[PDB]
């Protein structure tokens, strides 16, 4: 239970909601040409350089 401030928690929330797959409708729109994403990650890896 490390204690974050408002901005630190906001940046963690941004990282969390960035950690999402590309939408299937986006894949359909791009015709399976944008399927990947540079901000995908896992929580148990090299940590965020955000906090």
């Amino acid at each position: 239970m490390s204690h974050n401030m408002k901005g630190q928690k906001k940046r963690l929330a941004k990282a969390h909601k960035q950690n999402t797959r590309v939408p299937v409708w986006v894949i359909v729109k791009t015709n399976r040409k944008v399927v990947s994403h540079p901000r995908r990650r896992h929580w148990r890896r090299r940590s965020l350089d955000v906090k």
Partner: peptide
């Protein structure tokens, strides 16, 4: 309004 309770979420 009798009272307000507030929290911040992990969606920002």
């Amino acid at each position: 309004v009798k009272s307000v309770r507030t929290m911040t979420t992990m969606k920002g």
